[PDB]
Design a protein around this ligand. Structure first.
Ligand SMILES: CCCCCCCCCCCCCCCCCC(=O)OC[C@H](CO[C@@H]1O[C@H](CO[C@H]2O[C@H](CO)[C@H](O)[C@H](O)[C@H]2O)[C@H](O)[C@H](O)[C@H]1O)OC(=O)CCCCCCCCCCCCCCCCC
Ligand SMILES: CCCCCCCCCCCCCCCCCC(=O)OC[C@H](CO[C@@H]1O[C@H](CO[C@H]2O[C@H](CO)[C@H](O)[C@H](O)[C@H]2O)[C@H](O)[C@H](O)[C@H]1O)OC(=O)CCCCCCCCCCCCCCCCC
Ligand code: CLA
Ligand code: CLA
Ligand code: CLA
Ligand code: CLA
Ligand code: CLA
Ligand SMILES: CCCCCCCCCCCCCCCC(=O)OC[C@H](COP(=O)(O)OC[C@@H](O)CO)OC(=O)CCCCCCCCCCCCCCC
Ligand SMILES: CC1=C(/C=C/C(C)=C/C=C/C(C)=C/C=C/C=C(C)/C=C/C=C(C)/C=C/C2=C(C)CCCC2(C)C)C(C)(C)CCC1
Ligand SMILES: CC1=C(/C=C/C(C)=C\C=C/C(C)=C/C=C/C=C(C)/C=C/C=C(C)/C=C/C2=C(C)CCCC2(C)C)C(C)(C)CCC1
Ligand SMILES: CC1=C(/C=C/C(C)=C\C=CC(/C)=C/C=C/C=C(C)/C=C/C=C(C)/C=C/C2=C(C)CCCC2(C)C)C(C)(C)CCC1
Ligand code: OEX
Ligand SMILES: [Cl-]
Ligand SMILES: [Cl-]
Ligand SMILES: [Fe+2]
Ligand code: NA
Lengths: 37, 38, 348, 76, 36, 31, 336, 30, 449
């Protein structure tokens, strides 16, 4: 388990793996926003 | 409309179609010889 | 119609309305293809989410029970039903829809509407090819998938005991159908199936080869590093160097294409011929007329206890399919087999 | 012409959709949750797969009396 | 016309679709078909 | 509008949206 | 000025004037595949029965020992040796080499070198002729499938006896036991590959139909309608627009394949990436990643198992499990 | 003669493909 | 960024536009490194948050907690975890380094210098200056040599690294006098890749591991110095293509070969990849099954030396292709298995029948049975073991994961090497865009026939 001083922070920890998948999708968002010029 | 036939046509078999037909016959042969021999 | 007066009737008004440029074209086949296809896809989608198969197959093949996209299937009716068209108004349902379901009627609904939708889709291709005034080689090609559909979903259950032995509209039920032909029919050993496999593999080979060769011999046609912006439909010149492609494949493979027409007709011919050969083989298996065994090898195996080959092994694995799988796949036949008479070897 | 590049970008398309699409969504939700899908399409409940008289998978094994057979073999 | 960006429309549609597939994949481990 | 495109896209849209709402309900159903 | 021997040698190797381009990848082309093909022909004709499973049960596999070409197969290497690299010189005798499945390792290793060098030779001719070189990248999918079925699956399962037999009925046996031990049919990579060959057939038929349909009158019912003009002219007037118009009017007019370059790129990449996916699926199966096992997943409110198509597939899978390699087992559960 | 006829057929296929590679018609029209 | 008409590169090739913008290129690189350490730290934190201590650590689907635990941080004399604070601090440091690296990447991607020669000649570079490219390569080689020597220092003087071959069942062993024999190390690198030798995966002791690490760090430092103080030779210039595309292709080939090597390591290695942390390999969980049924059936009173199974070969014991005594089951292919719980059971003759009859320790018994139950099967949707088996256990082997994923990545990276190698050659030659259409090379030579 996570240490005692950090135990209630396991919810914000638990979502952190998917952020790199959100990064390439954010690149696609920016390309849509610039309309794929 | 006369004695000779104006609808006469001659047959043409080029070497590519020759090779394709020979390959077809021998592939059918290798496929079905094992089954007719049984 | 040959500079005649051609007095206008309701037919000409209807033809003028049907042959119009819209988002989606309707035409005459829209009288058939649109309702038949929409009903087919809607029936399959509805049966894959709500319509259970507990009554007919004794199993769950719908999302409402605990099945996934790779598990749900619009299942066939029971074998005791034979080959009924299984109408909602027939002697089976007697006009009742909520019990027309869970009895295999939706399978027959989807199959018949899909067959007529395929008919309407070839009519679609024909009449659009008429409107654009082009040859219907697309319909010529499409004659093979519907031959496969007829030989698989109609001819095979019609020749066998009933719709129960037809493939159910799904994914894992199709896989069951595949393993069913593997064990019960030895469909791999059938020469027509070998032709079908060769046709599909060669068609994918032609697809990859043609795409790669055209896309790697596509000239410069500009200054930008992106090749796709260099294509222009206004110019009449060819996009790719066919002489360069022919030289490349002649020096790599040994033989190469010289004619675009013969290339594209080969790409047309190979899958159509393979699929028709597979359709003929399934027509053969519709009558239980199998290429199951080799007489010389089975006699040699019977009179020689130390002569074994992969064919003998395949026969044994087919017996594994039948003995361990028919008992649950055929609940109507009531296989209460003890599991000490099933063929099961060491440990496993 | 409406090439779909102008319908989506206008809020007039979304004001007539901000309630109709969620309306269809909640309609499907209530349709499944009230048991109406089970009632209309013949699926048994998870608690009504087997009756008390039979504890094995059901078989039709009949054609002209199959309607009354599925009536007796289904959940009351 | 142009009151909302087409890219923002596609992005919110993609978010809704990805979340839809996500809750579909989540519902495979619980409830019906959970194998437990 | 009620044109041919409208009818086609609505015949594909309305029951698919109904089925998605249905299945999102189906995901939270437990035995 | 090419008056030295190895300069003339590099000139003849590099030259495109030979009937078949050899190249610097060709110097590993020619001997490796002639070695593999020679051993394949001689083994398929007159090989003694090969002990595949290591339990002194040899598979005949060769025509002169009493089987046809449908059931004849160059049998994989023995289970006793495993993937231990056993060539002729490691064998005390040619008879021992043939009994332990040495020709299988010979042909498979030489075929692997041959396919990699055929990849390189395709790139090499692409370089000497000045085209784009990604034809080898497109051919990287069937070779990936070949390596996955021939060496990678034996590496994952521990022994070359696990590999594909070099034949037809042996191919069927390998495929069936593959389904039995891995549930390949219910794997998304295998579904992607099946969709890829189905779409390859579909798109090949569609492209052939759309090109052969979009033609102008130049070849009549006779051999050629050249009365307007014979051969020796550069007039390109086949068709440019009507095929795309037909494809647009087919369904919804927004599936834009007007760009023939984009059409051919998609036509190449779809089956290639799908065969990449199924080849990687087979390589993952080598490390026992298996398929979707939704068996006994449907249960009622009482927890009782409700059967399904996946359960039927599971029953067939265990039916092939309890029959393959008839007397190879000693211990209950099957571990590689 | 069981294996010999398959031998004839296989040699015929190899000879046909060898002749198609080497003794082929030259590629005309581009 | 820029658009397509000024670069000739579409959106789906946008990173190609950075082929000449070195400042934006290094910014993308450092943001990428920040992404890598972000995944590392986030996975460490999530994996500690989802950690069960009493359950053995390879059963939670854990891939890089074994990476720290192999180094000997927070683990006892039996593979017991005891504490997870070293894992926690490693994850937090990786997360903070990710924050600072991503800040640098974002800064150089947006308002970094567009080009570097006009402001920083030490960082300014083209793709043609061989001396400058070798200088950069030398700097990176020195960094990698220091990184390998850091592991050497840890294994030598820092009280780390978990020896699975330590007596009793593995322990955190301080490695003293590592074997730096050049003959031994070169014999490891030039031996056969097959099952007889194993090439690079068959390393079996920390002495050889740290000796090879000493060798690699030493040559990496010296090669960094060499490339800094030299310039490529004319034969290297004539044999290589010198552009940024070609360099990428060479790196892609090398990293694809590395990925295949790592796949084979994760599947077969048992020394650098401890079975206590990763579960059984390929050979074990089958050799474990053989040994466990061997000891069970000798406990029931049968004669395992008798054996003589279904095919007349032996249900428990057999002679290998060489005269050593091996297991007689279907695991007669894995007889080259060397594991911690068979080597005291194994001697020059074979499996030591007398040691099989008498000397079997209960820890070996428990380890073998546990490795039987947690076999490296597992299916991709979790579920149990064999594809024919059912929903009984939730376990997929991390060795299977680290093999399958890394083979997939290595194969795509081989394909990417091929793509970029062909494109670099065609770009240096000039016909990357296509055929010039006014002088095609086909009409420059005589026809074949
Ligand atoms: C040339 C002709 C073909 C060559 C085929 C090579 C096959 C290599 C192989 O048998 O692979 C396995 C070898 C290692 O072999 C294993 O090595 C093992 C070493 O473990 C030993 O050491 C361990 C650590 O202590 C344990 O103690 C263990 O008990 C002990 O057995 C054992 O010897 C195993 O029996 C043995 O299987 O890995 C390696 O060679 C690592 C090198 C990477 C190989 C990658 C294989 C894929 C290659 C290309 C794929 C793409 C091709 C192009 C596609 C298009
Ligand atoms: C355009 C737009 C973009 C479109 C993209 C389309 C492409 C792909 C779409 C996404 C594909 C994945 C979607 C499904 C994600 C999911 O359902 O998520 C699946 C899981 C589910 O989460 C949990 O997964 C757990 C897995 O068990 C693990 O833990 C268990 C004990 O708890 C055991 O120890 C077991 O061994 C161990 O595996 C349990 O099953 C839990 O019940 C379950 O809730 O989440 C996870 O892990 C997620 C893991 C992150 C991805 C990892 C990728 C695979 C990496 C290496 C393997 C490579 C393989 C190559 C060949 C194939
Ligand atoms: C117009 C498109 C179309 C087509 C081609 C079909 C075709 C088909 N449907 Mg279907 N159906 C449709 C639309 C269509 N349907 C619609 C819109 C609905 C929703 C209400 C349905 C609902 C439906 C159900 C519930 C079922 C079918 C079924 C069937 C199949 C068998 C029908 C049958 O045998 O009964 C007979 C049909 C006919 C004889 C056609 C009638 C044409 C007659 C001859 C015209 C007579 C008019 C005449 C001029 C009257 C004036 C004369 C008077 C003044 C003297 C069949 C392939 C069944 C099935 O699939 O089997 C499982 C079935 O269960 N359909
Ligand atoms: C590892 C992924 C990655 C990275 C690091 C980059 C990096 C970069 N790309 Mg890019 N790209 C990628 C993937 C990536 N790309 C993919 C997958 C595609 C295909 C869709 C593209 C296609 C592409 C194109 C077409 C172009 C680039 C361009 C660029 C460069 C400048 C972008 C710019 O200035 O506009 C500004 C961008 C933004 C303002 C949006 C990004 C917002 C920030 C930077 C990211 C999110 C904030 C971040 C989380 C804050 C961190 C906090 C910190 C304290 C830790 C830049 C160095 C451009 C170029 O070529 O340079 C001239 C350009 O034309 N890329
Ligand atoms: C001497 C100059 C120098 C040094 C020291 C470095 C160092 C580094 N560069 Mg860099 N680079 C340089 C010049 C230099 N570069 C130049 C001139 C360019 C062209 C503009 C680049 C372009 C460049 C790019 C594009 C990238 C790097 C990256 C990296 C890092 C990769 C190693 C890593 O993170 O893995 C792990 C490191 C270790 C395991 C080693 C542990 C640390 C040891 C113990 C300290 C070494 C002490 C040593 C004696 C001091 C260095 C001496 C020096 C003279 C070499 C690394 C710290 C990559 C990066 O961004 O990573 C963040 C990367 O993407 N560099
Ligand atoms: C989806 C992207 C992805 C992800 C999530 C991973 C994830 C992982 N990879 Mg991987 N990889 C990828 C892509 C990816 N890879 C690709 C595309 C390739 C090319 C095909 C590779 C090739 C590859 C190889 C060759 C290897 C991995 C390995 C690994 C595992 C350990 C990573 C590691 O420590 O490496 C190394 C990290 C560094 C080099 C950073 C330098 C810092 C050093 C290590 C510091 C020294 C530590 C020191 C001892 C600390 C002591 C403290 C001291 C102060 C006392 C890990 C789970 C390893 C593995 O487990 O094999 C199965 C491994 O060998 N990967
Ligand atoms: C670290 C390695 C590396 C690097 C630095 C590059 C760099 C580059 N590549 Mg390249 N490539 C690589 C590896 C690499 N590649 C590999 C391994 C492959 C084989 C798959 C390719 C295949 C490839 C092609 C076909 C092309 C490039 C191109 C390019 C250039 C433009 C990239 C771009 O902006 O596209 C934009 C990036 C995207 C649109 C995102 C792509 C998303 C992919 C296709 C889907 C997979 C994502 C998914 C999460 C992964 C699933 C898991 C996986 C294991 C399957 C650029 C300089 C282009 C080029 O040649 O220009 C010179 C080009 O057309 N690459
Ligand atoms: C070192 C190189 C290694 C390769 C050597 C072995 C490759 C064999 C050559 C391929 C087959 C040649 C096809 C002849 C047919 C032939 O050459 O016809 C000639 C034909 C040329 O046609 P054209 O382009 O001239 O068409 C226009 C005409 O109308 C005008 O002439 O070539 C082709 O059809 C395309 C090639 C497709 C090749 C299809 C492969 C067929 C599979 C063969 C399987 C053999 C049996 C298995 C063994 C038992
Ligand atoms: C750490 C460690 C170790 C060590 C290891 C080692 C020692 C390694 C190495 C290694 C090495 C020492 C390597 C090397 C290498 C190299 C390479 C791999 C190369 C290459 C190249 C190529 C491939 C080429 C190509 C070409 C040609 C063909 C000719 C012309 C030019 C060109 C470029 C084109 C050991 C295991 C002991 C222990 C554990 C850990
Ligand atoms: C049966 C029946 C009928 C019919 C009906 C119909 C015809 C309808 C329908 C319907 C429909 C028609 C439905 C549907 C469904 C659908 C769905 C359920 C979908 C989906 C899902 C998903 C999940 C997706 C995803 C995705 C993808 C993958 C692709 C792209 C992207 C996205 C994301 C979208 C009636 C009543 C008449 C009567 C008789 C019986
Ligand atoms: C340029 C560009 C790009 C890229 C971008 C990037 C790549 C960014 C990044 C970045 C990064 C790479 C970031 C990272 C980060 C990290 C952070 C920001 C952190 C932190 C911190 C904290 C606050 C923590 C806390 C804690 C602890 C200490 C332990 C326990 C748990 C917790 C969580 C509580 C894109 C593609 C979009 C597009 C194109 C352009
Ligand atoms: O050899 Mn072909 O399949 Ca691989 O797991 Mn163990 O070994 Mn046999 O059984 Mn299952
Ligand atoms: Cl078998
Ligand atoms: Cl065994
Ligand atoms: Fe074309
Ligand atoms: Na057995």
């Amino acid at each position: 388990k996570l240490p005692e001083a950090y135990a209630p922070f396991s919810p914000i920890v638990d979502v952190l793996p998917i952020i790199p998948v959100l990064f390439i999708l954010l690149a696609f968002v920016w390309q849509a926003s610039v309309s794929f010029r | 409309m006369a004695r000779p036939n104006p609808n006469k046509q001659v047959v043409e078999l080029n070497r590519s179609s020759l090779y394709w037909g020979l390959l077809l016959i021998f592939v059918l042969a290798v496929l079905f010889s094992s089954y007719i021999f049984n | 119609i040959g500079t005649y007066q051609e007095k206008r009737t309701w037919f000409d008004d209807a033809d003028d309305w049907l042959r119009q440029d819209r988002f989606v074209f309707v035409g005459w086949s829209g009288l058939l293809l649109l309702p038949c296809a929409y009903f087919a896809v809607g029936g399959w989608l509805t049966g894959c989410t709500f319509v259970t198969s507990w009554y007919t197959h004794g199993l769950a093949s719908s999302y409402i029970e605990g099945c996934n996209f790779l598990t749900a299937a619009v299942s066939t009716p029971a074998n005791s039903l034979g080959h009924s068209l299984l109408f909602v108004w027939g002697p089976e349902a007697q006009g009742d829809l909520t019990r027309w379901f869970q009895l295999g009627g939706l399978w027959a609904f989807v199959a018949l509407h899909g067959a007529f939708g395929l008919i309407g889709f070839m009519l679609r291709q024909f009449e659009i090819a008429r409107s654009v005034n082009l040859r219907p080689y697309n319909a010529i090609a499409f004659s093979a998938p519907i031959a496969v559909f007829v030989s698989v979903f109609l001819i095979y259950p019609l020749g066998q005991s009933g719709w129960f032995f037809a493939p159910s509209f799904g994914v894992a039920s199709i896989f069951r159908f595949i393993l069913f032909f593997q064990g019960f029919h030895n469909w791999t050993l059938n020469p027509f199936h070998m032709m079908g496999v060769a046709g599909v593999l060669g068609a994918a080979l032609l697809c990859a080869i043609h795409g790669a060769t055209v896309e790697n011999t596509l000239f410069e046609d500009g200054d930008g590093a992106n090749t796709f912006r260099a294509f222009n439909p206004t110019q009449a010149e060819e996009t790719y160097s066919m002489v360069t492609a022919n030289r490349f494949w002649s020096q790599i493979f040994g033989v190469a294409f010289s004619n675009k027409r013969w290339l594209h007709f080969f790409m047309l011919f190979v899958p159509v011929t393979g699929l028709w050969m597979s359709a003929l083989g399934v027509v053969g298996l519709a009558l239980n007329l199998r290429a199951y065994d080799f007489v010389s090898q089975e006699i040699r195996a019977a009179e020689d206890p130390e002569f074994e080959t992969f064919y003998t092994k395949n026969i044994l694995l087919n017996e594994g399919i039948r003995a361990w799988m028919a008992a649950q796949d055929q609940p109507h036949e009531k296989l209460t087999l003890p599991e000490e008479v099933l063929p099961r070897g060491n440990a496993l | 012409e409406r090439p779909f590049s102008d319908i989506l970008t206008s809020i007039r398309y979304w004001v007539i959709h901000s309630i109709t699409v969620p309306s269809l969504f909640i309609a499907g939700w209530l349709f499944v949750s009230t048991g109406l899908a089970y009632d209309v399409f013949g699926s048994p409940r998870p608690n009504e797969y087997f009756t008390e008289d039979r504890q094995d998978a059901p078989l039709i094994t009949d054609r002209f009396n199959a309607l009354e057979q599925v009536k007796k073999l289904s959940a009351q | 016309i142009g009151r909302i960006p087409l890219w923002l429309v596609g992005t919110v549609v993609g978010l809704l679709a990805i979340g839809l597939l996500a809750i579909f994949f989540y519902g495979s481990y619980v409830g019906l078909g959970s194998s437990l | 509008i009620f044109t041919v495109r409208w009818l086609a896209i609505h015949a594909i849209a309305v029951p698919t949206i109904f089925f998605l709402g249905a299945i999102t309900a189906m995901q939270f159903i437990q035995r | 000025e090419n008056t030295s021997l190895w300069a003339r040698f590099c000139e003849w190797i590099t030259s495109t004037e030979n009937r078949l381009y050899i190249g610097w990848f060709g110097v590993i082309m020619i001997p490796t595949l002639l070695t593999a093909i020679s051993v394949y022909i001689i083994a398929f004709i007159a090989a003694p029965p090969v002990d595949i499973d290591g339990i002194r049960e040899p598979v005949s596999g060769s025509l002169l020992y009493g089987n046809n070409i449908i059931t004849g197969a160059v049998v994989p290497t023995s289970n006793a040796i495993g993937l231990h690299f056993y060539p002729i010189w490691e064998a005390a005798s040619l008879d021992e080499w043939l009994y332990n499945g040495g020709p299988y390792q010979l042909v498979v290793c030489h075929f692997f070198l041959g396919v990699c060098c055929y990849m390189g030779r395709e790139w090499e001719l692409s370089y000497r002729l000045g085209m784009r070189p990604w034809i080898a990248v497109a051919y990287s999918a069937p070779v990936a499938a070949a390596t996955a079925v021939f060496i990678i699956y034996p590496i994952g399962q521990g022994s070359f006896s696990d590999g594909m037999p070099l034949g037809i009925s042996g191919t069927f046996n390998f495929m069936i036991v593959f389904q039995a031990e891995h549930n390949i049919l219910m794997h998304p990579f295998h579904m992607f590959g099946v969709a890829g060959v189905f779409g390859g057939s579909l798109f090949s038929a569609m492209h052939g139909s759309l090109v052969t349909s979009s033609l102008i009158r130049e070849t009549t019912e006779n051999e050629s309608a050249n009365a307007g003009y014979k051969f020796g002219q550069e007039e390109e007037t086949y068709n440019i627009v009507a095929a795309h118009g037909y494809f647009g009017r087919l369904i919804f007019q927004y599936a834009s394949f007007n760009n023939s370059r984009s059409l051919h790129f998609f036509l190449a990449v779809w089956p290639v990436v799908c065969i990449w996916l199924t080849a990687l699926g087979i390589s993952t199966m080598a490390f026992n990643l298996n398929g979707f096992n939704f068996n006994q997943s449907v249960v009622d409110s009482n927890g009782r198992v409700l059967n399904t198509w996946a359960d039927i597939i599971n029953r067939a899978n265990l039916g092939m499990e309890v029959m393959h390699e008839r007397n190879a087992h000693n211990f209950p559960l099957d571990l590689a | 003669m069981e294996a010999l006829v398959y031998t004839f057929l296989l040699i015929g296929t190899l000879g046909i493909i060898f002749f198609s590679i080497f003794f082929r018609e030259p590629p005309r029209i581009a | 960024g820029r658009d397509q008409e000024t670069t000739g590169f579409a959106w789906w090739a946008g990173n190609a536009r950075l082929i000449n913008l070195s400042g934006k290129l290094l910014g993308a690189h450092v943001a990428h490194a920040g992404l890598i350490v972000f995944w590392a730290g986030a996975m460490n934190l999530f994996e500690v948050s989802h950690f069960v201590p009493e359950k053995p650590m390879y059963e939670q689907g854990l891939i890089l907690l074994p990476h720290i635990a192999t180094l000997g941080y927070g683990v006892g004399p039996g593979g017991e975890v005891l504490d997870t604070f070293p894992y926690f601090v490693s994850g937090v440091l990786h997360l903070i380094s990710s924050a600072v690296l991503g800040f640098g990447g974002v800064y150089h991607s947006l308002i970094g210098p567009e080009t570097l020669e006009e402001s920083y000649p030490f960082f300014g570079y083209v793709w043609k200056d061989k001396n400058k490219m070798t200088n950069i390569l030398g700097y990176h080689l020195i960094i990698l040599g220091c990184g390998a020597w850091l592991l050497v220092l840890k294994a030598l003087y820092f009280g780390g690294v978990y020896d699975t071959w330590a007596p009793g069942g593995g322990d955190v062993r301080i490695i003293s006098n590592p074997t730096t024999n050049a003959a031994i190390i070169f014999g490891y690198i030039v031996k056969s890749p097959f099952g007889g030798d194993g090439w690079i995966v068959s390393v079996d002791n920390l002495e050889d591991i740290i000796g090879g690490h000493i060798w690699i760090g030493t040559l990496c430092i010296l090669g960094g110095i060499w490339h800094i103080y030299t310039t490529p030779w004319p034969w290297a210039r004539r044999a290589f293509v010198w552009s940024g595309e070609a360099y990428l292709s060479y790196s892609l080939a090398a990293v694809s070969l590395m990925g295949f090597t790592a796949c084979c390591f994760a599947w077969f290695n048992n020394t650098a990849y401890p079975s206590e942390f990763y579960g059984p390999t390929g050979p074990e969980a089958s050799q474990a099954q053989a040994f466990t049924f061997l000891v069970r059936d000798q406990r029931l009173g049968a004669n395992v030396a008798s054996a003589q199974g279904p095919t007349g070969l032996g249900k428990y014991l057999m002679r290998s292709p060489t005269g050593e005594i091996i297991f007689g089951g279907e695991t007669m292919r894995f007889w080259d298995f060397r594991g911690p719980w068979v080597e005291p059971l194994r001697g020059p003759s074979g499996l030591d029948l007398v040691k099989l009859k008498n000397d079997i320790q209960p820890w070996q018994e428990r380890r073998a049975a546990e490795y039987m139950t947690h076999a490296p099967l597992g299916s991709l949707n979790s579920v149990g073991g064999v594809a024919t088996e059912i929903n009984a256990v939730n376990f997929v082997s991390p060795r299977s994961w680290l093999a399958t994923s890394h083979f997939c990545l290595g194969f795509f990276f081989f394909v990417g090497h091929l793509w970029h190698a062909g494109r670099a050659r065609a770009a240096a030659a000039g016909f990357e865009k296509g055929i010039d259409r006014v002088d095609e090379p086909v009409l420059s030579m005589r026809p074949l026939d």
